[PDB]
């Protein structure tokens, strides 16, 4: 499943997966985005 959602930039791994990366579009909140799109 393609990674997508909301994640705290402090959370590791974000969205329960190290394959994805969290975009810090907020002070303590961001969004999960897969490094494949």
Swiss-Prot record:
Entry protein name: Albumin-1 B chain b
Disulfide bonds: 3-20, 7-22, 15-32
